[PDB]
Design a protein around this ligand. Structure first.
Ligand SMILES: CC(C)(COP(=O)(O)OP(=O)(O)OC[C@H]1O[C@@H](n2cnc3c(N)ncnc32)[C@H](O)[C@@H]1OP(=O)(O)O)[C@@H](O)C(=O)NCCC(=O)NCCS
Ligand SMILES: *[C@@H]1O[C@H](CO)[C@@H](O)[C@H](O)[C@H]1NC(=O)CCCCCCCCC
Ligand SMILES: *[C@@H]1O[C@H](CO)[C@@H](O)[C@H](O)[C@H]1NC(C)=O
Ligand SMILES: *[C@H]1O[C@H](CO)[C@@H](O)[C@H](O)[C@@H]1O
Lengths: 7, 323
């Protein structure tokens, strides 16, 4: 993880 | 300037080329990009709760179209790529890449300049939607928090959560007290409100949480009546029932998670995905060996102990009906 979103 | 020249000048990796092409084809914005300078900038930064140390640095390093042409090109188009989706929650949150720190303070604070340059457009959107000034400002103050987070995490000034600020800047997320709510839809297109918890504002007291929940429907039904959500949806390490092993009854997270109805399957024990989420939020983890991490709070000890035991934390997803 470590990235975010939300897609 | 051309996208390939920008890419090479800023030291951007080749994968960004597609983005840069999109931006090149999009072009500069109709309203030309304007950065606030000097005391105008200090006052705006202050209003946005950016700490004084960072604000002073942001103002000092503000880039210039002539000296920083590649950076400036990207600033205009990145601003444009955001405002073209004003009010549009169906578009993906693309804030653009972080700039390599070899470009200095202007590169480190790039997305702060994007945010600053975009404040007038989102505040116009706020007014058209009849959003109260204090709600609009309170929402945008998360910039200060995210700037402060970068410094704690990495040790110098910056703001590398630009994917997240696309929500504030498109006018699709609002802080309503302790909690934030975003215009969202599920996979089947049914409207809901996405819930998020800013770091700043103190503990998640039940009374504070409750007040925010009470504010959600009246706010969105007034200003976004076409939306019509009935339910809030959250995905978080905080919804992981495994926390009950380690946190006591006076834990705010434990008391509040009890209201939630989890909708995902019990995760595979070996799925290590939620680890990076809990590590980010509890420690602002940046690759340091687990032994060096602080152990002052019950949660800090819990995250590490669980990991040391060969076990994993999971992001869980659920909903609460809006009052
Ligand atoms: C949201 C937040 C304010 C909740 O704090 P809270 O209301 O104090 O939560 P609890 O009452 O459940 O805390 C239980 C214990 O864990 C500690 N704790 C809670 N959140 C913590 C965090 N992010 N980092 C370190 N310790 C934390 C508390 O200090 C408390 O310790 P104690 O038992 O030694 O007194 C806090 O976790 C936070 O700021 N997190 C960052 C934002 C975040 O996680 N957002 C959502 C991501 S999906
Ligand atoms: C996701 O990341 C951004 C940037 O780091 C943060 O600002 C958000 O706060 C994070 N999202 C998250 O907050 C989801 C929260 C769902 C909450 C579920 C209810 C909790 C009740 C205990
Ligand atoms: C992230 O995206 C999904 C799918 O569109 C949505 O269900 C969820 O609520 C979104 N989260 C936020 C915080 O908007
Ligand atoms: C989810 O997938 C999108 C594209 O589908 C990526 O941009 C994102 O980084 C994450 O992998």
């Amino acid at each position: 993880x470590y990235x975010x979103x939300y897609x | 300037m051309d996208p390939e020249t920008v890419r090479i000048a800023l030291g951007l990796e080749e994968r960004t080329a597609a983005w840069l092409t999109e931006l090149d084809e999009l072009g500069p914005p109709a309203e030309p990009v304007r950065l606030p300078r000097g005391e105008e900038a200090r006052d705006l930064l202050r209003r946005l709760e950016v700490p004084e140390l960072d604000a002073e640095e942001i103002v000092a390093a503000a880039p210039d179209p002539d000296r920083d042409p590649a950076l400036w090109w990207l600033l205009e188009r990145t601003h444009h790529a955001i405002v073209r989706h004003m009010g549009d929650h169906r578009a993906k949150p693309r804030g653009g890449p972080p700039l390599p720190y070899e470009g200095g303070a202007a590169a480190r604070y790039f997305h702060v300049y994007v945010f600053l340059a975009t404040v007038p457009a989102v505040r116009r959107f706020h007014a058209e939607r009849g959003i109260p000034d204090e709600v609009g400002w309170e929402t945008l103050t998360q910039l200060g928090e995210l700037v402060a987070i970068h410094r704690r995490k990495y040790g110098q000034g910056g703001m590398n959560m630009q994917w997240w600020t696309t929500y504030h800047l498109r006018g699709i997320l609002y802080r309503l007290g302790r909690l934030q709510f975003s215009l969202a839809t599920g996979k089947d297109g049914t409207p809901h409100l996405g819930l998020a918890v800013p770091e700043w504002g103190g503990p998640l007291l039940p009374k504070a949480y409750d007040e925010s929940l009470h504010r959600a429907r009246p706010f969105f039904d007034r200003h976004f009546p076409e939306h019509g959500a009935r339910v809030a949806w959250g995905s978080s390490w905080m919804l992981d029932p495994q926390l009950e092993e380690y946190l006591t009854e006076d834990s705010n997270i434990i008391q509040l998670a009890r209201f939630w109805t989890l909708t995902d399957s019990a995760p595979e024990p070996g799925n290590a995905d939620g680890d990076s989420s809990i590590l980010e939020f509890v420690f602002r983890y940046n690759g340091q060996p687990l032994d060096e991490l602080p152990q002052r709070s019950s949660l800090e000890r819990a995250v590490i102990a669980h990991l040391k035991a060969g076990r994993h934390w999971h992001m869980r997803t659920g909903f609460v009906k809006l009052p």
